[PDB]
Motif scaffolding. Structure first.
Motif, PDB file in Angstrom:
ATOM      1  N   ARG A  16     -24.946   3.658  28.423  1.00 16.58           N
ATOM      2  CA  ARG A  16     -23.522   3.619  28.736  1.00 16.58           C
ATOM      3  C   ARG A  16     -22.855   4.902  28.259  1.00 16.58           C
ATOM      4  O   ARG A  16     -23.098   5.370  27.144  1.00 16.58           O
ATOM      5  CB  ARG A  16     -22.845   2.400  28.100  1.00 16.58           C
TER       6      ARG A  16
ATOM      7  N   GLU B  22     -17.561   3.972  28.648  1.00 16.97           N
ATOM      8  CA  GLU B  22     -18.099   2.639  28.958  1.00 16.97           C
ATOM      9  C   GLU B  22     -18.828   1.966  27.783  1.00 16.97           C
ATOM     10  O   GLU B  22     -19.313   0.849  27.936  1.00 16.97           O
ATOM     11  CB  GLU B  22     -19.045   2.709  30.165  1.00 16.97           C
ATOM     12  N   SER B  23     -18.903   2.632  26.628  1.00 17.21           N
ATOM     13  CA  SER B  23     -19.577   2.083  25.438  1.00 17.21           C
ATOM     14  C   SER B  23     -18.599   1.343  24.535  1.00 17.21           C
ATOM     15  O   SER B  23     -17.464   1.789  24.351  1.00 17.21           O
ATOM     16  CB  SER B  23     -20.231   3.202  24.623  1.00 17.21           C
ATOM     17  N   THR B  24     -19.050   0.223  23.964  1.00 18.16           N
ATOM     18  CA  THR B  24     -18.286  -0.506  22.946  1.00 18.16           C
ATOM     19  C   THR B  24     -18.116   0.333  21.678  1.00 18.16           C
ATOM     20  O   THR B  24     -17.088   0.247  21.006  1.00 18.16           O
ATOM     21  CB  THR B  24     -18.957  -1.845  22.573  1.00 18.16           C
ATOM     22  N   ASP B  25     -19.134   1.136  21.370  1.00 20.49           N
ATOM     23  CA  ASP B  25     -19.114   2.069  20.256  1.00 20.49           C
ATOM     24  C   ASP B  25     -19.936   3.289  20.667  1.00 20.49           C
ATOM     25  O   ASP B  25     -21.168   3.224  20.716  1.00 20.49           O
ATOM     26  CB  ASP B  25     -19.698   1.394  19.007  1.00 20.49           C
ATOM     27  N   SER B  26     -19.250   4.396  20.958  1.00 16.18           N
ATOM     28  CA  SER B  26     -19.893   5.614  21.473  1.00 16.18           C
ATOM     29  C   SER B  26     -20.907   6.238  20.509  1.00 16.18           C
ATOM     30  O   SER B  26     -21.866   6.867  20.957  1.00 16.18           O
ATOM     31  CB  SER B  26     -18.842   6.657  21.874  1.00 16.18           C
TER      32      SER B  26
ATOM     33  N   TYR C 101      -9.732   8.685  24.022  1.00 14.40           N
ATOM     34  CA  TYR C 101      -9.834   9.484  25.247  1.00 14.40           C
ATOM     35  C   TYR C 101      -8.472   9.923  25.782  1.00 14.40           C
ATOM     36  O   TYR C 101      -7.461   9.259  25.556  1.00 14.40           O
ATOM     37  CB  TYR C 101     -10.640   8.702  26.293  1.00 14.40           C
TER      38      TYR C 101
ATOM     39  N   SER D 280     -12.246   0.983  31.234  1.00 15.02           N
ATOM     40  CA  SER D 280     -12.788   1.643  30.028  1.00 15.02           C
ATOM     41  C   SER D 280     -12.989   0.628  28.898  1.00 15.02           C
ATOM     42  O   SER D 280     -12.105  -0.186  28.638  1.00 15.02           O
ATOM     43  CB  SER D 280     -11.862   2.773  29.558  1.00 15.02           C
ATOM     44  N   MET D 281     -14.147   0.679  28.240  1.00 18.43           N
ATOM     45  CA  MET D 281     -14.580  -0.394  27.331  1.00 18.43           C
ATOM     46  C   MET D 281     -13.670  -0.584  26.111  1.00 18.43           C
ATOM     47  O   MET D 281     -13.415  -1.718  25.710  1.00 18.43           O
ATOM     48  CB  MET D 281     -16.032  -0.165  26.889  1.00 18.43           C
ATOM     49  N   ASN D 282     -13.193   0.517  25.535  1.00 23.74           N
ATOM     50  CA  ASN D 282     -12.239   0.478  24.416  1.00 23.74           C
ATOM     51  C   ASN D 282     -10.817   0.850  24.852  1.00 23.74           C
ATOM     52  O   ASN D 282     -10.052   1.412  24.069  1.00 23.74           O
ATOM     53  CB  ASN D 282     -12.710   1.402  23.280  1.00 23.74           C
TER      54      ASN D 282
ATOM     55  N   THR E 248     -12.767  -6.108  22.929  1.00 27.30           N
ATOM     56  CA  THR E 248     -13.918  -6.276  22.042  1.00 27.30           C
ATOM     57  C   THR E 248     -13.474  -6.638  20.618  1.00 27.30           C
ATOM     58  O   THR E 248     -14.140  -7.419  19.939  1.00 27.30           O
ATOM     59  CB  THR E 248     -14.791  -5.004  21.997  1.00 27.30           C
TER      60      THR E 248
ATOM     61  N   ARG F 195     -15.042   9.098  16.353  1.00 27.26           N
ATOM     62  CA  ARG F 195     -16.390   9.504  16.744  1.00 27.26           C
ATOM     63  C   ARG F 195     -16.398  10.872  17.412  1.00 27.26           C
ATOM     64  O   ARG F 195     -15.346  11.396  17.787  1.00 27.26           O
ATOM     65  CB  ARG F 195     -16.990   8.441  17.659  1.00 27.26           C
TER      66      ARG F 195
ATOM     67  N   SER G 238     -17.533  11.768  20.324  1.00 27.18           N
ATOM     68  CA  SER G 238     -17.102  11.668  21.719  1.00 27.18           C
ATOM     69  C   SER G 238     -15.605  11.946  21.874  1.00 27.18           C
ATOM     70  O   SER G 238     -15.192  12.598  22.837  1.00 27.18           O
ATOM     71  CB  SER G 238     -17.446  10.292  22.287  1.00 27.18           C
TER      72      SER G 238
END
Lengths: 503, 503, 503
Positions: A159, A163-167, B146, B153-155, B165, B385, B387
């Protein structure tokens, strides 16, 4: 019999611990500066395909950072992809791709050589370390929970960042590492991706355990790092199992090109304020050894997604493993010997039973079921969940759905990645009380593992039972430049008469 | 050389630490009661649109809670929304919307005035505190990862409670704050949402750093809180970047109505069991200052989603920043000076290189790549993070998809929110060892930052490089009612000769 | 007035804390081995449908593990499901299904009977323990955040292993417990699922609180465990609210068959290295009691998804609760008395106001709002987020969407599961300072709770206000085998004059 009287205490909020001149101090500080990094080039140009010997040779004065890192960059061309595939959340890197790619490494410090096996070390260490510690070792620190990766799976490691829960806990693109996808023309069956991965070297005597605040080495007149480079697609590149192939082709074809590498270290002068550096500095540098292994063809006649109790119970028993001393911990796993798909997760088996023999004491843990084996491993550091460890069917309702036909049930079925069972000699409960961790006593061990495998009915693959030992092993840095390492062995009587520490 | 002898210990489970009358005690307790809350109204009616000066004036006897909170309520009308837009997981509040809305605040305690800048304070503090600690300050504690927010988008921070989540780490509706969406007719192009936000005031001398166990103030004969109220849509309301506009309109139009505000404090009598309150109580009240800033137009000629190395390397260099003493920490960020879209994330740049000059010592950190700058900032508390920090393309495969046409590649592209680089003077590794944290020594600093921006090819915007200082600053409460604050300054020799604490 | 002089310290990294012979020691160890497990069958075959008395009677010598576990296995047939339903992420078990299914339990240790109520104990304990502790008690430790479970909800507790954000925090299939779904023919309206659940018994005097490292029991010459078995579908089986029914059927029909049960214990001889086991061993064994309850029919006239302020403010007030001593903590919750749907989450109300009376001190907490009641409960260990606690509409935008017609708005609406308010006597701020935790002082308590319910307009259900007490209570194990238990009561003057512990 009457209950004893107990003393009382009056608890109060920490808010009432008034900060005053009696309990408040002002800190200034010194630190390991960030102006101290050096890039060390290899002695020759690295092989263009990442396969060959790689050597760093650089004398370093004063203090050198205890956890040196390797920075690899390369282009990966992936071929035989079905035309106009989006590839969303389906391409990334495998876990610890740098250390995976180094089967053997030799480090020379002032004439003392340390030989170790990074790929072997990180294969164990990834399952029994704190995930936040592991995220400081590598940008691809997340370990596969399941034997098949699909795009829609919630913790799919490929992902993307968004799209990640935790990058941080993804190995996808737009997460922890730099990348660039080459422009994709309409109807193209291949993709080229540039990668850069900055990862800590897991090899004796580096301080990969204490990655948060590693103790530095001093006065390295000779400092050589010799790597057996195997930076090949199988060790580095990850492709989800639901990426479709071109008609005719069996697997994907991947090529590594433009491969470059350098070593990143910190080098600096010790500050005067810490005082004299001690004459002998000790480093925690554990020794991992493969104590025994044995392989066998495992053919599944019954469906792995069917009745758990009817899944084929494969058995593997090691030969007698002779050991001159007693390790602090062991690790048991049953892995696929030759991978079927080069870019899929490592296919480990779900261990359902474990029989251990130590000397004449036999049949230890034969009574235990999966839940108890999971608790055993978890109490010794195992860092994944039961859904992964068990190797059980993870998506039962998805498979049992009538909308899925009988021919497509295996394709939909996703299993836990499989077991790794960490156990200490103290977990065994041996009659022979002299069999203690760090004891200078000979023992003979034999391990039988009963397990189930994720292969379909009427298919099979070779699986190897591996038993590893984790020994306490220290490296000593003497003032004159000499380095030595040795096991920390004592007599049983010394260890049994040592003072108690209840923790 | 010979390895030294090491003493041994016998470890055993904590289960064998038998509870007995020798090691067990029964607790009773006193606490800060929850019967002690008071609602303080402002001296005059707050402006209907939340724009104007707001003053609280309320003397409080005995102990007052150290982290007072502001409770705002208002209706927000969002116009120019495309007709029959579902708006699922697309509307919410920006991070720390109360403190964002207060550019300057003045707190009076017994004649002593404290002037601080809450919007400026929280903008830094949100990046270097513990997320759980931040969640106690505000119901909208989660910080954008972001530069664009999309529904899927997941978060996505505007995901509703049921779609998040972690609902505590969302700023959406049905999470941490009370709300009500007004009924929406078919074909309506606007929406009205009532909000209520209970948030801790981040202004000196409040104990926002110690939100878990805040030390109370005592005997506030004069207690005034004067706020520069700027509760405007841009500072509070959040709309996802994929919410579609009505044809003709450039941006959404948002109106704040029915604005009300009150201050929530705890007030109680000190219990007798804690004993005498000390004559002088000390409060940690750090001083954040903008030490320098400079801005310029940043035009991107090449695509930000293209080759990372070919992204336009913008440079901004501050003027010489004169400082009479040495702060404990610095914070560097490059942000959009004027926001293009009022209700999108704050657009920070991705800093790829940093160069620092302190006195005659030049070119510090010029060697460091993004990974090392991330490490630097993370070691000093940076709480997001890589990212996010990098400002790199977060969804490369989604953009590179052939199904996405050339004209829509920028629309699909999502980048990390951008960099904030925290560094201490000890991280610099200066030759001049007298440049210590909390030293009474003058210095001149200059900061050059190389960065990349998320704007498309053939577009641009103004970006400002800001360098902040975080100084250790204490507020002293004397027994006669007097309050003073001051920096904790010492000579370089005092600090260098101070006792060692290895932590 | 002048600021006082403060001492200074020089901080430095932990890396300079050089490991040497002076500060390094080598550990060997003993442990509680994993060769010590024993299965205890019940005296007679367990009831086939899980309903009836179940008894274990097995004397055990030497040391027995402090947290014994019950292992249940059964088949669950679920009927009245709409034909060809995929059921993906829509079937699982409820939270703590073993302990839910035991309303009362009697444990005999050497003639001393402990009568406790596991279903009642775990219903409170699940809300004020560390989630990682709870995961060691049960494979279904995740508690419902919301009053309806839908398949697509992000933290839907019936998400399968591959579809969960954290498989340990899911109760779905392919997570923490073993299962098997029987083959499903096309057009079938039912499903059969085999379950196996391995869960710790939550009953006095078991060490469920210290699940990580429980203190063992000694010389259980009489050891009996008598359970009122209520292992019925309503207590164990979970079905998502968006699973569709066959036409004509109101609810699902579920049958439990093939129910078996055993008790898993550890039993071993104490090692000589720990020395003499003390004569009197103390065990933390807290006493939960329902101090009062009262019910009423709660009819909602206005929509629960509408204006929060216009939601029907239901009031329930307990009768006077006479207590001979002062407990360490209280717990308040308003629950649905008779569940409408047997396989949905427990419907708790959202408590918006709380009024407490203690002796002649009246109107305590009447001033407090939901946010402050959440803070209060959280400060005493409450382990859920505000979105759950509040009972507020969690998905306002989904409901407000014009695409959803007025008749379907209630169906789409999802609410927080509801409130549990933990409070201590010290939180009340009573004038009577003698009302202390663990005091032997009589008090009369009355609790009024104002709440909102998730039922639709023109519908209702019975709701019960329950007020529980959590008392400090110790079990003493004397050398001859005698077990006693008693409260830890003292005089108010003893507790007030006890030494301060600021924590």
């Amino acid at each position: 019999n009457t209950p004893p009287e107990l003393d009382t205490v009056l608890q109060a909020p920490y808010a009432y611990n008034w900060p005053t001149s009696k309990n408040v101090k002002i800190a200034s500080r010194i630190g390991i500066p960030y102006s101290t990094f050096q890039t060390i080039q290899p002695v020759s140009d690295a092989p263009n395909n990442g396969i060959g010997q790689i050597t760093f040779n650089q004398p370093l004065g004063n203090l050198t950072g205890g956890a040196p890192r390797l920075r690899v960059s390369f282009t990966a061309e992936i071929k035989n992809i079905l035309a106009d595939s989006s590839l969303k959340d389906q391409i990334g890197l495998k876990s610890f791709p740098v250390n995976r790619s180094i089967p053997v490494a030799v480090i020379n410090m002032n004439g003392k050589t340390f030989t170790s096996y990074p790929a072997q070390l990180i294969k164990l260490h990834q399952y029994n370390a704190d995930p936040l510690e592991l995220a400081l070792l590598s940008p691809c620190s997340d370990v596969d929970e399941y034997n098949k990766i699909k795009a829609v799976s919630m913790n799919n490691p490929y992902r993307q960042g968004t799209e990640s829960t935790d990058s941080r806990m993804s190995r996808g693109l737009g997460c922890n590492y730099a990348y660039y996808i080459h422009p994709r023309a309409a109807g193209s069956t291949s993709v080229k991706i540039d990668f850069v991965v900055d990862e800590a070297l897991v090899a004796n005597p580096t301080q990969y355990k204490n990655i948060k605040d590693p103790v530095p080495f001093r006065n390295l007149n000779t400092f050589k790092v010799i790597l057996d480079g195997q930076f090949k697609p199988e060790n580095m590149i990850g492709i989800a199992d639901d990426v479709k192939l071109v008609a005719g082709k069996a697997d994907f074809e991947v090529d590594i090109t433009g491969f470059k590498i350098n070593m990143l270290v910190q080098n600096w002068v010790a500050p005067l304020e810490i005082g004299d550096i001690p004459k002998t500095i000790i480093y925690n540098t554990p020794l991992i050894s493969l104590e025994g292994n044995i392989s066998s063809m495992c053919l599944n006649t019954k469906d792995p997604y069917g009745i758990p109790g009817e899944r084929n119970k494969h058995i593997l028993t090691t030969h007698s493993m002779a050991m001159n001393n007693v390790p602090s911990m062991f690790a048991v796993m049953v892995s696929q010997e030759t991978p079927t798909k080069k870019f899929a997760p490592d296919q480990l088996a779900g261990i359902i039973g474990l029989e251990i023999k130590v000397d004449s004491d036999v049949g230890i843990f034969r009574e235990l079921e999966q839940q108890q084996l999971y608790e055993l491993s978890s109490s010794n550091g195992y860092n994944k969940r039961f859904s992964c460890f068990s190797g059980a069917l993870a998506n039962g309702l998805t498979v049992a759905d009538p909308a899925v036909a009988a021919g497509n049930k295996f394709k939909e079925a996703i299993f836990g990645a499989g077991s790794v069972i960490f156990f200490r000699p103290s977990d065994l409960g041996l009659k022979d009380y002299n069999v203690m961790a760090n004891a200078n006593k000979s023992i003979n061990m034999q391990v039988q593992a009963t397990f189930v495998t994720p292969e379909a009915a009427g298919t099979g693959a070779h699986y190897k039972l591996e038993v590893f030992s984790i020994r306490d092993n220290l490296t000593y840095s003497f003032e004159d430049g000499t380095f030595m390492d040795d096991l920390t062995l004592y007599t049983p009587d010394q260890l049994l008469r040592s003072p108690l520490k209840l923790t």
